[PDB]
Amino acid sequence: DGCCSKMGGINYCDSSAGRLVCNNGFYSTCYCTRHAVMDLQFLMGCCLWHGGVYPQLNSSGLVVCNDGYVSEECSLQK
Amino acid sequence: VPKLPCRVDGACDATIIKMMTDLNKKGIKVASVGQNYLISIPASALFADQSPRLNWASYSLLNEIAAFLKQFRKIAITVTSYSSKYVSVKRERALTLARSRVVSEYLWSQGVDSRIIFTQGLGSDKPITSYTLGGDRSPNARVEITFRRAV
Amino acid sequence: IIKTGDIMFAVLDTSVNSDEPGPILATIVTGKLKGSKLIGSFNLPSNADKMVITFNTMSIPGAEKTISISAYAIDPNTARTALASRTNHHYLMRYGSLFASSFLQGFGNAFQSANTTSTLENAVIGLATVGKAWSQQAQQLFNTPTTVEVYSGTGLGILFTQDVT
Amino acid sequence: IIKTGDIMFAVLDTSVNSDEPGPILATIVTGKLKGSKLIGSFNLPSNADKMVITFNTMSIPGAEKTISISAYAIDPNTARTALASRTNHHYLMRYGSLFASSFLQGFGNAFQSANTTSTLENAVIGLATVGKAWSQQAQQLFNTPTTVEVYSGTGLGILFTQDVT
Amino acid sequence: IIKTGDIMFAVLDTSVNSDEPGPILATIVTGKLKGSKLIGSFNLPSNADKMVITFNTMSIPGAEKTISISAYAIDPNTARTALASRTNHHYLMRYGSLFASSFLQGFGNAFQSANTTSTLENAVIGLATVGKAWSQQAQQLFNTPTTVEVYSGTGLGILFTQDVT
Amino acid sequence: KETALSVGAQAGLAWRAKIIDEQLNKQARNLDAIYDFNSLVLEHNILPPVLLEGRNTLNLADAQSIRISDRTYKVAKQAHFITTPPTWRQYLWMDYVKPEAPNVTLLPKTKAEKEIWCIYTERGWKNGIDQANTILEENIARIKEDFGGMILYRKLLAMNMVSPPYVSHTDLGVTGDGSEIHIDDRVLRITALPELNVNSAEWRAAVAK
Amino acid sequence: GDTGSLAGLQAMADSKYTRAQKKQKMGKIREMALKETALSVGAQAGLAWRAKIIDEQLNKQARNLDAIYDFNSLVLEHNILPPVLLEGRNTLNLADAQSIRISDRTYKVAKQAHFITTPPTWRQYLWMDYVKPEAPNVTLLPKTKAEKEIWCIYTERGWKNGIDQANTILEENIARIKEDFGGMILYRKLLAMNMVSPPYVSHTDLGVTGDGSEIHIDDRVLRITALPELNVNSAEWRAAVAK
Question: What residue ranges carry the coiled-coil annotation (chains C, D, E) (predicted)?
Answer without folding.
Answer: none
